[PDB]
């Protein structure tokens, strides 16, 4: 309760000091299109990469939370035994 | 056994005291990562106060 | 202008075919779709060649810059998952998880930081941090059904998207503390006072830079993970991960605060210091071969933060030449861990014992990939520690020196300790193998790709400080490409 | 006057090397009873 | 409405998603407390860019990537909870600290 | 004159050592490759004779087989070898050494594929330690020889193997970054950012910058070669040890601390070793009388001889810290002497372990009864140790005493304390050593012949050893100038420099 406190107490020292450069710039003439060129002429690279996050984030979710029922008693092979869908680093304690 | 005592004895400190600070300082690594989010945040507290003073 | 990205659009390519044909063939493909990365990775790394006489054109609006800065850490980060394939091509497939699935977590993790290295704005740099991080909790939770990976994973996300929570509020300032402004060389024209603003802006963004290159403050999801998450994964979070952070670290903390030098120089001294004390004893305490090489990493990032507080022509050279041979031995020590791992169960020490007449060449390359850890001569990490003593000495920092060689003595005695338990160890002394170890073959699947990733990186590891007088050339050339 | 080193250095050198390489043939009880066998000092 | 208390509203979100992710114990309100802590980002970025820059906004469109990645991260994230919560029985961070000598 | 000589000695057996793994015929224990090691050190000891005999070109100073290549401009090291008088003889004794510690390891089937690895490595690493001209190469030498140690300690040793082959190469990498602090300090002084040995010492440095890099050096230096309080490692490194293993640390390895003493604390650092040279020759007294009282205290009689090569260690530290020409000849003639004569008492030591296998001393007796030909060279071998005349450990000696009571460096009643304190190692050296040898063959009851000892035997190549050692060990005994007309160029070069800073 003091760490966040003291990140607050941190934070409004810093918000009420500093002298922030604000524009008088009549803003956002329908800001759709201002928001849109923006996504191919700016931020075109972010906004590609992003569609390669989403696929990923789409690949591991499936997988980490699917209920495997194609093959679930599959020790496929063994050296030495190890279990499906687990890390052949097996627990032992020295 | 005398001379080699007081510096056999830096080997009974130094060489001691080297695997005890890396058994003392292993129960900073204690799980529960909500205590590692701490240190994380602690830094960011501590870093600022390190660099305004 | 699209010509600067294409070593990381060729592995877009390269990372769309190894998932439609894990569609399309359905686990028939994962026996050639290995090898469609390699050569997936290896094109992206032989267009960097072309790339490299090119006079550094600042492309994509300003948003992307493809120096020879850039050039370099983009091809650590495509070697380190061309080494993490070669490990990996066997190890989760006798884990029963898709071959296909993995490498397209494994390559998006890839063009994350391929994309971290040559960034420029605000949003192209949190974007490519976050295709890092996404893929790195996905990758090291991708067994899924082991209550250590699976806590590894998560105490990974909780650190992971809070430290990108911490770095965003740090580059939401930056955009606020200019007016506007989210390219870095434009942050650094508008703002050069030192206000507190800019400070907590730093700290701010420096939790998430060091969140990657796990500096101790900041380094506790490294040991956790590293033991529970996937080896191969283990092996790139350690290399490429790393790399990535630091390419981030230096295009950011030199482009975008130039005025603000020698307040992260001392937190970053702070940061060094604390690593290689607390990487490099409380590794001195280990029984686990993964966990060993956790604080190994967090110990031997405070070495390449020598390189990083001098703030030389030769302090980021050594930051470099440093990062290039961590790479042929972080992926030489953890594939033969993994080399061990296949052929036994419980890869930890003690169950090392008795080895060099049974698996000798995994107790070559280990031994070699563990011995230039701790910079024994005349090995690639002896050579890689001079330079950056060499460029210590040469400005200042003669106690960040005398830390760097007594911790690397401190390091000495803990990778000898896996030498002592691969060759000195009696043959009436082994704990595994005692009539038990099988025989190893190179013929089955996986385990030739994981043969020519072994031999490799010990002939980058053993010739690679004695002929590396081009490789002096090669990363000197980088550092004309700082400010 | 002194006896310089070089001229009896290189006049026993082929006198050393030859008889090294025949002292390696003519061993004994390091082949036969040998009970610290295959170790050096156990 | 002033630019400085957008951002004490801002500091003070970020301010309680911090503790809640140090005080929760189950281990979805911290990812609930991760999303209090991306949209503090994102307060800021809107109040920037409405005050600083409004006439080309960029911490508009830096505010749509972030919501975004805190898309695919609670996505990945709960996941991630669905997988401890298949193996260990439970939601609750206190019983994760597995790897304690 | 042409051929890189100096480095094809280094490389030869460094390079032919990676034809040891593709040694064919494994018939049981490693017969071939133990012939193929004594293949490749034979013929390399010829290249240090055929460049010496040829190229050396003796009475001047300075490098003779000098060859300076190109390695790292970008740091500013290079590959600089190169022979001067005080190289040259320890180079030439590592090479005739080493090819006696190939033969000596006869005996050595545990690992012999991974052992004449380790020994040609540091057969190639310990010449690259005396025939650089550079630092980071130096440095590079000296913790080359640390991997190739521990391992010929912590697999063919005693019980306490792994207790002393861990001391070790703590002490030694421990003390080795010292070398790096104070040969990047040095190259950094100033405005020359120049490495290379010779360009250093040319380089003037201040009084208050020399005591430190002399500090740093002597805790790099009194390490290696055993200044008594750091000291500590060498008798568990030394007992738990085998004969091969023992030949490369007590004759080679400790003489590169007093090599580099005269390299990098006389002729760089001179002005600073004008104000810490009498602590050393303190030091060198107190290392000759602990030694030898802590000798004769002891049961162990690999131990005893471990000790015993501390305590002939400290005429040099008496020899190089007294600006004499007689005593910087005393000190690298002891450096020789030693190197010769504790190989062949190590080697004998190892010799009737093999045969008796107690190594305690109070468990012997008699053993000469039945074994008479180790019994005949133990005796020519430690009566060699006793600075007896006729044989070199006495002019070595002698040389020291002389040169250090005859200079015009310290005062009179100084003079005095050290010269009798000094010789007091002439009366304690028989007490240790004949103790040792009447308590170990001189005796008719015996052990109990049941359990151990029930063997015993003397074999031609054993002799050929002890041989090949005492005849540059009466040699040199008999005529000091074989080996001082190669000092004399060179250490008269090294004491005038030194002789410039005297007046302080």
């Not at chain 1, 209920?67 to 092979?77: A, G, H, T, Y």
């Not at chain 3, 305490?285 to 686990?288: F, K, P």
């Not at chain 6, 006793?386 to 044989?391: D, E, V």
């Not at chain 6, 015009?408 to 005062?411: L, M, P, R, V």
């Given at each position: 309760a003091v760490v966040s406190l003291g990140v607050f107490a941190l934070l409004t020292k810093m918000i009420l000091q500093t002298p922030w450069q604000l524009s008088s710039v009549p803003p956002t003439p329908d800001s759709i299109t201002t928001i849109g060129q923006h996504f191919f002429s700016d931020f075109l690279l972010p906004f590609e990469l992003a569609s390669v996050l989403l696929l990923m984030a789409l690949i591991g979710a499936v997988v980490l939370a699917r209920?495997?029922?194609?093959?679930?008693?599959?020790?496929?092979?063994g050296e030495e035994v190890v279990p499906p869908?687990?890390?052949?680093?097996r627990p032992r304690e020295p | 056994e005398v001379d080699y005592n007081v510096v056999d004895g830096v080997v009974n400190l130094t060489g001691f005291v080297t695997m005890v600070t890396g058994e003392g300082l292993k129960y900073l690594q204690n799980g529960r990562a909500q205590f590692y989010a701490l240190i994380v945040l602690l830094a960011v507290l501590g870093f600022v106060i390190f660099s305004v003073q | 202008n699209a010509g600067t990205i294409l070593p990381e659009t060729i592995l877009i390519v390269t990372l769309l075919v190894v998932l439609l044909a894990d569609l399309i063939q359905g686990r028939q493909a994962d026996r050639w779709t290995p090898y469609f990365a390699i050569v997936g990775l290896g094109g992206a790394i032989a267009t960097m060649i072309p790339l490299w006489t090119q006079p550094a054109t600042i492309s994509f609006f300003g948003s992307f810059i493809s120096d020879h800065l850039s050039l370099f850490f983009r091809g650590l980060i495509a070697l380190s998952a061309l080494g993490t394939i070669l490990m990996s091509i066997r190890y989760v497939e006798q884990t029963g998880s898709s071959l296909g699935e993995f490498m397209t977590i494994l390559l998006t993790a890839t063009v994350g930081g391929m994309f971290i290295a040559g960034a420029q704005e605000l949003v192209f740099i949190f974007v490519a941090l976050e295709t890092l991080s996404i893929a790195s909790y996905l990758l090291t939770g991708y067994t899924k059904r082991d209550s250590r990976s699976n806590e590894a994973a998560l105490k990974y996300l909780l650190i992971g998207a809070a430290s990108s929570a911490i770095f965003l509020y740090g580059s939401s300032l930056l955009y606020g503390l200019s007016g506007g402004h989210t390219q870095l060389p434009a942050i650094a024209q508008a703002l050069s006072s030192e206000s507190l603003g800019l400070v907590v802006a730093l700290v701010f963004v420096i939790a998430g830079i060091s969140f990657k290159i796990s500096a101790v403050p900041f380094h506790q999801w490294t040991p956790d993970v590293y033991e529970g998450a996937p080896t191969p994964v283990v092996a790139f979070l350690s290399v490429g991960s790393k790399a990535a952070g630091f390419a981030l670290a230096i295009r950011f903390l030199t482009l975008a605060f130039p005025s603000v030098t020698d307040q992260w120089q001392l937190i970053f001294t702070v940061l060094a210091i604390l690593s290689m004390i607390l990487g490099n004893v409380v590794a001195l305490?280990?029984?686990?071969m993964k966990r060993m090489l956790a604080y190994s990493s967090i110990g031997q990032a405070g070495f390449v933060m020598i390189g990083f507080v001098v703030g030389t022509e030769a302090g980021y050279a050594s930051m470099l030449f440093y990062l290039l041979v961590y790479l042929f031995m972080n992926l030489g020590a953890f594939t033969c861990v993994i080399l061990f791992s296949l052929r036994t169960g419980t890869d930890q020490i003690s169950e090392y014992a008795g080895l060099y007449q049974k698996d000798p060449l995994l107790t070559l390359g280990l031994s070699l990939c563990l011995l230039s850890l701790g910079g024994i001569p005349p090995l690639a990490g002896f050579f890689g520690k001079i330079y950056l003593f060499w460029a210590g000495w040469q400005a200042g920092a003669y106690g960040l020196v005398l830390l760097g060689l007594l911790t690397s003595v401190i390091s000495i005695y803990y990778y000898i300790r896996v030498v002592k338990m691969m060759v000195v160890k009696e043959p009436q002394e082994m704990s595994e193998a005692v009539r038990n170890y099988p025989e190893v073959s190179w013929s089955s699947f996986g385990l030739r790709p994981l043969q020519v990733g072994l031999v490799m990186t010990v002939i980058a590891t053993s010739l690679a400080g004695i002929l590396a007088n081009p490789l002096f050339n090669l990363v000197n050339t980088a550092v004309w490409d700082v400010p | 006057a002194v006896i310089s080193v070089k001229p009896i250095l290189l006049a026993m050198t082929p006198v050393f090397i030859l008889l090294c390489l025949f002292f390696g043939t003519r061993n004994g009880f390091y082949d036969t009873d040998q009970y610290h066998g295959n170790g050096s000092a156990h | 409405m002033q630019l400085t208390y957008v951002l004490i509203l801002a500091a003070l979100l970020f301010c309680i998603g911090i503790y809640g992710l140090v005080t929760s114990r189950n281990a979805v309100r911290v990812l609930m407390s991760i999303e209090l802590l991306l949209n503090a980002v994102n307060l800021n970025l809107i109040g920037f860019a409405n005050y600083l820059d409004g006439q080309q906004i960029k911490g508009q469109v830096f505010a749509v990537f972030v919501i975004t990645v805190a898309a695919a991260e609670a996505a990945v994230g709960l996941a991630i909870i669905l997988a401890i919560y298949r193996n260990r029985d439970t939601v609750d961070m206190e019983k994760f600290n597995l790897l304690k000598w | 004159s042409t051929f890189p000589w100096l480095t094809t000695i280094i490389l030869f057996p460094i390079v032919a050592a990676l034809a040891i793994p593709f040694i064919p015929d494994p018939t049981g224990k490693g017969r071939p490759i133990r012939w193929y090691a004594l293949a490749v050190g034979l013929i390399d000891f010829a290249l240090i004779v055929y460049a010496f005999t040829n190229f050396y070109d003796l009475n001047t100073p300075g490098m003779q087989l000098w060859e300076s290549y190109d390695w790292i401009p970008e740091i500013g090291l290079r590959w600089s070898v190169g022979a001067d008088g005080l190289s040259m003889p320890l180079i030439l004794l590592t090479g005739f050494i080493t090819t006696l510690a190939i033969l000596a390891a006869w005996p050595v089937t545990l690992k012999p594929r991974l052992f004449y690895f380790l020994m040609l490595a540091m057969y190639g690493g310990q010449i690259a330690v005396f025939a650089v001209q550079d630092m980071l190469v130096f440095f590079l030498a000296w913790e080359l020889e640390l991997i190739p140690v521990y391992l010929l300690l912590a697999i063919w040793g005693g019980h306490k193997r792994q207790y002393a082959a861990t001391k070790f190469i703590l002490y030694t990498a421990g003390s080795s970054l010292f070398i790096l602090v104070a040969g990047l300090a040095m190259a950094f002084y100033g405005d020359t950012v120049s490495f290379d040995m010779q360009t250093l010492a040319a380089k003037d440095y201040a009084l208050g910058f020399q005591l430190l890099v002399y500090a740093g050096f002597l805790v790099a230096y009194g390490v290696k070669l055993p200044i008594v309080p750091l000291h500590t490692w060498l008798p568990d490194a030394h007992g738990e040890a085998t004969a091969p293993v023992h030949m490369l640390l007590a004759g080679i390895l400790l003489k590169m601390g007093g090599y580099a003493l005269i390299r990098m604390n006389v002729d760089m650092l001179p002005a600073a070793h004008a104000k810490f040279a009498p602590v050393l020759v303190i030091l060198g007294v107190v290392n000759i009388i602990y030694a030898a009282l802590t000798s004769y205290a002891q049961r162990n009689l690999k131990r005893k001889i471990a000790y015993s090569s501390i305590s002939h260690i400290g005429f040099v530290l008496i020899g190089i810290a007294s600006f004499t020409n007689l005593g910087m000849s005393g000190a690298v003639l002891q450096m020789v002497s030693h190197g010769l004569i504790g190989a062949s008492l190590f080697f004998l030591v190892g010799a009737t372990y093999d045969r008796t296998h107690t190594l305690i001393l109070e468990e012997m007796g008699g053993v000469g009864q039945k074994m008479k030909k180790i019994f005949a060279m133990f005796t020519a071998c430690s009566l060699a140790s006793?600075?007896?005349?006729?044989?070199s450990g006495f002019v070595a000696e002698l040389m020291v005493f002389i040169g250090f009571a005859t200079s015009?460096?310290?005062?009179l009643p100084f003079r005095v304390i050290v010269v009798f304190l000094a010789a007091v190692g002439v009366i304690l050296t028989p007490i240790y050593l004949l103790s040792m040898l009447r308590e170990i063959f001189?005796?008719?009851?015996?052990?109990?012949?049941?359990?151990?000892?029930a063997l015993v035997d003397a074999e031609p190549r054993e002799v050929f050893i002890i041989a090949c050692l005492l005849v540059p060990i009466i040699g040199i005994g008999l005529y000091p100038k074989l080996l001082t007309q190669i000092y004399d160029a060179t250490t008269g070069q090294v004491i005038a420099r030194a002789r410039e800073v005297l007046p302080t």
């Open positions: 209920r495997e029922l194609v093959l679930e008693p599959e020790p496929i092979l869908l687990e890390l052949p680093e | - | 305490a280990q029984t686990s | - | - | 006793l600075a007896l005349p006729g044989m015009d460096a310290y005062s001189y005796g008719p009851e015996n052990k109990e012949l049941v359990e151990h000892e």
